[PDB]
């Protein structure tokens, strides 16, 4: 569930998705085109590329079980389905910690005319 | 979250809360009058008794921690109100799992026109 | 901005967009597909259509002004920008407000895959 | 929050925040030490000031309510945070005009190396 991703992004990286990543880049938040920008809109861009490959999973509010009990996050075993989705969010939470010395503030509300590129492919 | 008790009471009573449960007798589901009819009815009465115990939490929409191995649900660590609702949401679901020698077709779609009795105090 | 947006559904519907319309029928929330289920559905269909209109602005985040003081939602002047992605939100938060006599609880978490069929022309 | 105080400071200045104002002097946008050295700069170590008073607040991000219908930025009702995020803003964007007379371009891209010696009080 979107939520459940804002909070992996929060104990990963201590920003809360609104506003540090729900705009940035040309891939970061909902939608995106055009080329990934840098290491942080990368992980938006494998994230959303990842999401796309679950078709048949409902990717927005399908509840998976996780756990922080190690100190990082485990997905639970569960539905195929839950499964996917939740380790799409695990793997896109810790590549967005380990982009935050590359975080750029001016990049932090990016502008849709600046992704006016051809699209990578997944 | 009312999903994650729908998936709970899935792995109890091997049953999808919907349709085996959100319409069944006088309190399964949401809301509830009159008098329960049997077992089930008594989980889900009970249960909504435990959601009124927890008017300053967010008991329908609030995503808690759970885990389901080893064979049983647990309640992870959590806030106050994350634990309090799971705690709820688990002894509903193996409440129903345990109502299952009395679970009644006939009751599945029971009109609240029928749950005219004086209504339980909880 | 989608917070604002996000406020106005609020404003008008008497509900918060999450749970109520993030997941809503085959197109509230972000993205969709098919046909329209409902009423409601259909607010958001316009909603997408609306913003489709707006390839040159930055629907998601550009924060226009509103105001509430009348009692009723006024979208401010300013950019052509801010007063279209505004216009489109009011419309779309009022529609909701008109469609609440028909709305479904059972709609609220739709999946995709029951919004198969051929997508409807904006 | 942020994008509102920057569409304040080009309705008072005619100049948009990045890059005129962003990196000015000591105190214009994040951050700040030394002495303000001019009246621009000026504006900005007040505004900073007003904000610190405001440690209960999300000053950067929460979204107020403001209008420019009169002519002048006037700030809406709202939660005591909002009103007072906003009310810093206004004073802030008002100042900025007033202290073009003296605006250097010179300024512009502000060293922190000669921002050295003792940090003026609040
Ligand atoms: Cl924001
Ligand atoms: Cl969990
Ligand atoms: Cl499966
Ligand atoms: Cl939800
Ligand atoms: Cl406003
Ligand atoms: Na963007
Ligand atoms: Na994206
Ligand atoms: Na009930
Ligand atoms: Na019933
Ligand atoms: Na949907
Ligand atoms: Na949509
Ligand atoms: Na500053
Ligand atoms: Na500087």
Not at 72 to 81: A, F, L, S, V
Request: charged fraction near 25%; glycine fraction near 10%.
């Amino acid at each position: 569930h979107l939520l459940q991703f804002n909070k992996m992004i929060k104990f990963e990286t201590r920003k809360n998705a609104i506003p540090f990543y729900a705009f940035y880049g040309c891939y970061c938040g909902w939608g995106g085109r055009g080329r990934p920008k840098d290491a942080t809109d990368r992980c938006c861009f494998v994230h959303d590329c990842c999401y796309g490959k679950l078709a048949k999973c409902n990717t927005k509010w399908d509840i998976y079980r996780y756990s922080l009990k190690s100190g990082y996050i485990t997905c639970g075993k569960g539905t195929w389905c839950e499964e996917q989705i939740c380790e799409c969010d695990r793997v896109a939470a810790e590549c967005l910690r380990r982009s935050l010395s590359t975080y750029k503030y001016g990049y932090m509300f990016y502008p849709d005319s600046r992704c006016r590129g051809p699209s990578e492919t997944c």
